[model samples]
Target: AFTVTVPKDLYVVEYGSNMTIECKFPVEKQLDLAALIVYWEMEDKNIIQFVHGEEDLKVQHSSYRQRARLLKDQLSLGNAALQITDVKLQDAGVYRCMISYGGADYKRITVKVNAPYAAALEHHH
Candidate 1:
């Protein structure tokens, strides 16, 4: 079986902020769009999916309806990162990245959303 991994398994982002969960494939093994099926999930819910660049938003969870986006241009380079915009407190959880083709590989990311004040404090520093 093939394997996939998140460069950083843990992420901390302020509420209302934007962040990306990065997933990359081994350069030696390039991604094949024809047989690619990439998807992301959170809390047992489908967040997003990409069938070789053309996305499928019907399975997107409510909370992530318009908040999640896949970096399509980077997919050819083995990067399938999910960018979450206007992050909310409810967004804090473990997110799974699944790269399915003839075989499947999975990776998980734990997100901890911080309060808005955290961003304010940093802005002043």
Candidate 2:
């Protein structure tokens, strides 16, 4: 199955909370988060989804070893969302979602996440 382009931008998240990255492929049932690769990172080259897998959960990035999580269960309906717990200053930046069809079609997404709230300000961050 061919992959579709993911939304380029999402809501701005603050520090110390959860950001629900809603991902959707314009096609029906052609989306599989497990069979595909998904990645989130800073505007630089820092990767966050190092251990996320459709095979096994293993994060090579020690920084996000306990902070990032991929929701593969709801990907069947085009919801390849990532729930990042305990947001920090390091959690702020642009996020990209990439999906390869195990063969040819590869989808790309460029999402931005900025730091709005600080750790000592609010709980919704």
Candidate 3:
């Protein structure tokens, strides 16, 4: 009855800069923060999770501990976007956004890390 959506299937960002992956869902009315669950993962590795009206970091991967976060304020507006600070080369990959409200839905997003300076250096050769 419901579905998940993303701005684009692919995202490109510069290395060391912050990146925001946009995801959205339908909001019939005010959402039950306590009943909503959102999870972000990359290659089956947990990045971040929101459950029981708060963040659950118990199963989060060590590398994403302080860098990954969900936009809490926009949750009620049907936004489930994820923000990653200080994007790294290894961060370039496919990510999955899973949500469980009345039912479950998920979407996949691909990210490309671009190091502008690195590319510039290579161009000089």
Candidate 4:
């Protein structure tokens, strides 16, 4: 029987919290910064990217202008984690990270944002 190894595919985070979604290359492969192409997207909107070793914001969505960023220094080591700050309900959805070299690789995460009402109730209790 052939079995497949699966990576993390889901994330549940509270509203207004920071969330980090990672996309890493296969450990066996040598890091190639020169030809790397990193892209992150959600709901058909561009979140952020590292194309040819530079942060590409030309195609980024306005909503994520101040909230989204790639882990810059780590990009050289093949870690393409997208750090999203002040995550809101609108940020909840499937985020796709495409890291390409000669071919392409994809990592998908379904983010579930929990409501914040309960926290208010706790504050009053």
Candidate 2's displacement at residue 116, Å, is: 9.1
lDDT of each: 0.84, 0.54, 0.89, 0.76
Off by more than 4 A, model 3? 116-125
The regions of model 1 sitting more than 4 angstroms off are: 27-31, 116-125
- Give candidate 4's whole-model lDDT: 0.76
Q: Tens-digit lDDT track for model 1 on 1-125?
A: 56686789999998988999998765346667888888899988888878865898787888798899998877877788899999987788999899976778988899998885655464454
Ranking by TM-score: 3, 1, 4, 2
**Model 4 misplaced stretches (Cα beyond 4 Å):** 1-6, 27-30, 118-125
Q: What TM-score should be assigned to candidate 2?
A: 0.61
lDDT of 4 by residue, 12-107 (tens): 998889988877764336667787787889978988777777887777899898899998877656577889998877788898888776567776
- Model 1 / residue 113 / CA error / Å: 0.4
Top TM-score hit:
3
Model 3 lDDT tens row, 1-125: 77999989999999889999988988889888878999999998999789898887788898788899998998999999899999877788999999998888999999998986665454454
The C-alpha TM-scores of every prediction are 0.84, 0.61, 0.89, 0.81
Better of 3 and 4 by TM-score: 3
Candidate 1, lDDT over the whole model = 0.84
Best model number under lDDT: 3
